[PDB]
């Protein structure tokens, strides 16, 4: 074998402790740059002029943040969708002021995670598996794309990207409700059905399989030792599990097919979360939640409030207070 | 492969209908988001100048110009949040454009009634609306039956492009598994991993 | 139950309705800053983590199946009473080990963990809401308020969120709490520029 | 910043004590006969 052949053999090697692969060849450096830039910024980055109004926001620990409040602040509204790599800045000091770390981190991140997904396909192919784990992974990835790239694109600025921080996350959320009434959007509701339901079926599945483990141990030892890695025989009794759950609700509401069951387990949170993502991604272009403001009117024409209008009042509080110095004109059009 | 390509094309179309006003003329499709934000700025710049404001020297609350400021490369642009959209270009705004960006003397002297009209129309037909098509911001009251065509077309094609990317992944991975002969699962008597050395 | 019991009345409990529940969410933000509460955060971790496990487990099983039929549709190639595992634990473990670095190797542990995560999450969240009944919130970081109070150039996403909360309270309270007879004059309503 | 001055000891003991409990248990586990 020549050098290139040997290299290819190493890269796609199924014996490497962590799989590299060709997707990994792109993924690794990008995720490293992103991680390192993130970590360093989170600790030490100076305040960032997020809203382009020369009103810098401190995101880093050393500049007075804790873990919950800390963030990497989105790049300046003055930049918008302009590409702002370090070399477009006159200095690192300027780069930092306008929030370059945000763009560097999220772009490397998105590239890296796309490659992570590709990498899941690649390795699944290398091990002789079916290939769709990566399809399962596409839901959170799509969400990340929705909040870091697609929303900024639609609104015309990365300053509107989700900040890389917990409290900044909440900020992004409150402002999103204010501008799109996301709660009243069926795609977000589908998202919610997705994660709540995901949790429900996870707990459910956990509980039924755990409930039907075949006795292989004594009471003075963990039941986990009742299963040995790689054994051919199944470790629980699915017929008993189905017997239980099928009587809990009714027979035909229960799975006797493990494959069908696990497919459902895959599909529900994943499809739902695809919808959450599409929710963010379409409100990105301001097709917003249901608007039932003043939907209810009496015979004379008096407005009769519904819960939608109270939501509306909350939304208003949010609208008027967010980014208190950025607006000069009465409408927030993006 | 075709699913992948159509997915790519879908995303391209989404951005096309969102930003471009040439092959998607705003006369037919409505204003772009950028067009409309800029249109708000134009409208009130006009209003206040009519009222006697010096819009060039008008300092906003932040220190930035209330109506006019510089882009990061120095171009004169509408100020406030609409700063993000300074890359917007439209037939109604460009006559106010000079070599260095918005020309203060043209603004002071050359704004025509058709521009005020156009700016007002676009400002008030910004591409914002509810799923049931209540026009305007999410907190706006029922009154206006409106969602911009730009939003319908951009959103529809994002959803579609995305699911087609999903389909791409599904079918490319399956074509791989089927070509290699394990799309139906692992051979019990020939489990590849079982012939591999342990990782540790 | 506990929450309204800690408040003035059942009035402030969630109402049984879609939008009403949403209002309940937004109230908790504005009034309790409930997102900032680490019990809710653990709730989040348990729910999203449970959904993650659900998806990842289903997919892993579905992509490590043994070929047990000739059908290209693989569901029929299973029999409930069969003794053998329907998917390869060994291949799944290697896959995730090489992809992610760690992997389940024990199915019983995997599934107990699948029980544990969402159940524990919800439980933590329940504890936090029990705190909210008494208005015993994580509303503020004191160090933050002292700094921001003395230093008007100091801004974090935390202070920004408090502005949002303050808006929520003033704009929603009169209609949300009609028994209070709130009258908030235009001039007292907190607003930023223009909006 | 005007932090709670006990936050340091609180956090430190919160990490260390159970960490230590667990390390004790692991180590006495490994040394049992194979």
């Amino acid at each position: 074998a020549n050098l290139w052949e040997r290299f290819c053999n190493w890269v796609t090697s199924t014996d490497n402790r962590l799989y590299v692969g060709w997707f990994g060849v792109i993924m690794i450096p990008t995720l490293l740059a992103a991680t390192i830039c993130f970590v360093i910024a989170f600790i030490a980055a100076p305040p960032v002029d997020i809203d382009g109004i020369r009103e810098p926001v401190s995101g880093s620990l050393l500049y007075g943040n804790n873990i919950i409040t800390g963030a990497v602040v989105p790049s300046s509204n003055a930049i918008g969708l302009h590409f702002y790599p370090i070399w477009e800045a006159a200095s690192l000091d300027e780069w930092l002021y306008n929030g370059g770390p945000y763009q560097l981190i999220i772009f490397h991140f998105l590239l890296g995670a796309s490659c992570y997904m590709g990498r899941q396909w690649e390795l699944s192919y290398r091990l002789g598996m079916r290939p769709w784990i990566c399809v399962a992974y596409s839901a959170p990835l799509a969400s990340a794309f929705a909040v870091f790239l697609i929303y900024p694109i639609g609104q015309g600025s990365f300053s509107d990207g989700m900040p890389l921080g917990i409290s900044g996350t909440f900020n992004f959320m409150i402002v999103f409700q204010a501008e799109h009434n996301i709660l009243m959007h069926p795609f977000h509701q589908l998202g919610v059905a997705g994660v709540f339901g995901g949790a429900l079926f996870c707990a459910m599945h956990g509980s039924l399989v755990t409930s039907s483990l075949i006795r292989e141990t004594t009471e003075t030892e963990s039941a986990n030792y009742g299963y040995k890695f790689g054994q051919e025989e199944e470790t629980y009794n699915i017929v008993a599990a189905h017997g239980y759950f099928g009587r809990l609700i009714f027979q035909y509401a229960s799975f006797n097919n493990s494959r069908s069951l696990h497919f459902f387990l895959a599909a529900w949170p994943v499809v739902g979360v695809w919808f959450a993502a599409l929710g963010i991604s379409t409100m990105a272009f301001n097709l917003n939640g249901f608007n039932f403001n003043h939907s209810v009117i009496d015979a004379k024409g008096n407005v009769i409030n519904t819960w939608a209008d109270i939501i509306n009042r909350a939304n208003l509080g949010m609208e008027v207070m967010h980014e208190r110095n950025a607006h000069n004109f009465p409408l927030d059009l993006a | 492969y075709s699913l992948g390509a159509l997915s790519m094309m879908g995303f391209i179309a989404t951005c096309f209908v969102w930003f471009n006003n040439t092959v998607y003329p705003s006369e037919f499709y409505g204003p772009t988001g950028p067009e409309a934000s800029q249109a708000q700025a134009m409208t009130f710049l006009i209003r206040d100048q009519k009222l006697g404001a010096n819009v060039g020297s008008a300092q906003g609350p932040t220190g930035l110009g209330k109506y006019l400021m510089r882009s990061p490369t120095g171009e004169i642009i509408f100020g406030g949040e609409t700063m993000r959209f300074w890359d917007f270009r439209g037939p109604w705004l460009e006559p106010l454009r000079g070599p260095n960006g918005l020309d203060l003397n043209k603004i002071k002297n050359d704004i025509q009634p058709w521009q005020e009209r156009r700016a007002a129309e676009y400002m008030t037909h910004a591409p914002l609306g509810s799923l049931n098509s209540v026009g305007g911001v999410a907190t706006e009251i029922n009154s206006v039956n409106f969602v911009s065509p730009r939003s319908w077309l951009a959103t529809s094609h994002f959803v579609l492009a995305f699911f087609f990317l999903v389909g791409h992944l599904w079918h490319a991975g399956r074509a791989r598994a089927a070509a290699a002969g394990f799309e139906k699962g692992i051979d019990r008597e020939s489990e590849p991993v079982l012939s591999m050395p342990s990782l540790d | 139950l506990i929450y309204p019991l800690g408040q003035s009345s059942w009035f402030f409990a969630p109402s049984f309705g879609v939008a009403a529940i949403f209002r309940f969410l937004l109230f908790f933000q504005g009034f309790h800053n409930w997102t900032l509460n680490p019990f809710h955060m653990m709730g989040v971790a348990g729910v999203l983590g449970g959904a993650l496990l659900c998806a990842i487990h289903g997919a892993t099983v579905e992509n490590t199946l043994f070929q047990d039929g000739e059908g290209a549709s693989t569901f029929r190639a299973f029999n409930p009473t069969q003794a053998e595992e329907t998917y390869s634990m060994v291949t799944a473990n290697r896959f995730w080990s090489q992809i992610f670095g760690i992997a389940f190797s024990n199915k019983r542990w995997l599934h107990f963990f699948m029980l544990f995560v969402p159940v524990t999450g919800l439980w933590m969240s329940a504890i936090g809401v029990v705190g909210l009944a008494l208005n015993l919130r994580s509303y503020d970081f004191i160090s933050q308020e002292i700094r921001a109070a003395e230093d008007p150039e100091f801004e974090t996403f935390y202070t920004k969120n408090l502005l949002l909360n303050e808006g929520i309270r003033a704009w929603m309270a009169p209609q949300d709490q009609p028994h209070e007879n709130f009258v908030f004059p235009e001039e007292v309503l907190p607003r930023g520029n223009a909006l | 910043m005007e932090v709670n001055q006990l936050g340091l000891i609180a956090t430190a003991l919160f990490v260390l004590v159970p960490s230590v409990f667990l390390i004790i248990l692991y180590v006495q586990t490994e040394s049992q006969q194979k």
């Binding site: 600790i43 620990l61 050393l62 873990i67 | 342990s198 | 670095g101 | 932090v3 936050g7 340091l8």
Partner: peptide, 30 residues
């Protein structure tokens, strides 16, 4: 000091990742 603590805890976690991955107890087929 807060910052020291936070960064410290984080570092402990990354180290933990490292041990948990490369120095895990190996899975064995019986």
């Amino acid at each position: 000091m807060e910052t020291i603590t936070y960064v410290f805890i984080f570092a402990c976690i990354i180290a933990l990742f490292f041990f948990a991955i490369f120095f895990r107890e190996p899975p064995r087929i019986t």
